[PDB]
Subunit: 149 residues, 4 copies
């Protein structure tokens, strides 16, 4: 490398590309938002210990959140959330306006960003999100995934 299934890249053409790679599973997701998502950073599980993924932090003073999955027993079972521009940041390129997170234990981590734009949805009937791919310019411009069993 060992490779993984990389399903996706939902978002747009600009920003700067970042592939954090692959790990055993997710422990914490922490993002900043207002009308679009700006910051996205994750705390992975690496063989029993926590691993802090690289950060893709925004300069925009957006509203802040921390999603804390209860590890082993809880893992996401669905990722969805629209995509499109934001004439305000004067950025012509498509961008991730929202991004909601469902869980196998039921807990859904409420829509973040305004549900305006075109919808993308990804339900997992069997599998495991194991890492994140995507781009980040001023906000998070595109999002991608890493799957495994």
């Amino acid at each position: 490398a060992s490779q993984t299934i990389t399903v996706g890249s939902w978002g747009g053409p600009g920003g700067n590309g970042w592939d954090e790679g692959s790990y055993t599973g997710i422990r914490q997701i922490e993002l900043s938002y207002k009308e679009a998502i700006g910051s996205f950073s994750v705390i992975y599980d690496l063989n029993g210990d926590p691993f802090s993924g690289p950060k893709h932090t925004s300069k925009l003073p957006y509203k802040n959140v921390k999603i804390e999955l209860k590890f082993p027993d809880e893992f996401l079972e669905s990722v969805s959330g629209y995509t499109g521009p934001f004439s305000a940041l004067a950025t012509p390129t498509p961008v991730v306006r929202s991004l909601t997170f469902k869980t196998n234990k039921g807990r859904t981590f409420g829509p973040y960003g305004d549900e305006e734009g075109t919808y993308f949805n990804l339900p997992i009937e069997n599998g495991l999100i194991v890492g994140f791919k995507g781009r980040t310019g001023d906000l998070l411009d595109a999002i991608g995934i890493h799957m495994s069993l």
Copy 2:
């Protein structure tokens, strides 16, 4: 019982559940369509030789298309769609209304069924659709996918 990453479920809850399991590759898809997708049946590749999976047919007089891939060098890199109910089959439940496939070699087997309702899109950077899962009643009620490296 070896297992696969089963991604998705896109479509409604009506129809009879079907699963065709996992193979080694896709050799030819066959579908009928007309304002919605009726029949669905894929011919797979089992260890270098062709293996026809179960047929999932509709009695509806729908238009017919044969999608045949050049098998080893060509595979689907994207499956998109629009799932939306259909008041004509008097079906209140959601149904997959359109279906578009895009190849790693550059050919998009143009949108079959009319592009109406909520769009779905699943792009792949490294992975392989290795078996189809789905529901069928009179139309292709739903669509599921299985994956591998």
Copy 3:
């Protein structure tokens, strides 16, 4: 193709190469033996339904045996068995002499052929024997293993 992890070449470079392929799992193994292993063909599982793998039969008038596992619930957790030349077969190269299979339920299919030669050993901790590869000329010149989750 999708690929699987292929561990194995145990035996010698002689004979003709055979790769039976990767399937869903194993339902019955069928071999022949005297002083060494001669024929080896298996019945595989192909998505809930049995599937016959090609026969790799040895012309040698040998003792016969059918090993059948209780499918789903019982599966191979171990494979092992002695390899060396056979001055009789006037075979200048090393060939497989004995082969013993151990089960997750306790069942162990007694050494078939003679325990003579250098020994090889594969205990599986997590994983699944999914297809058989190897070489066959008069006897089984060599054996390989396919694996998945």
Copy 4:
């Protein structure tokens, strides 16, 4: 909670069981030995940067090798090595007496420890050793491997 294929545990039941877990690849191995293998510590690759796995050290004053593979073009292609007891450590239980590492590039990191006891041979045709698992007490009592595509 993702899994990888773990094969084996070639050794004896003595000592304290350890499992470094899985990563992206093997960059360096560092062991000690005289008549049996004493220390075993590996510097893994995690997504592009080195990640040191835990050290499993041994007080026995042994020779000290430092194995560095050229990480992306070079990876292990086979592991082999003799398992037998060791009268001198006054131990009743089988230990990993010897250990040899072959590479896909051609280099064979010749025998470390004596070639004595029963033999084991893990040869690989397709796949990646992606993590080591095992048991240490005074020396290296057992060794197991993790696999991925």
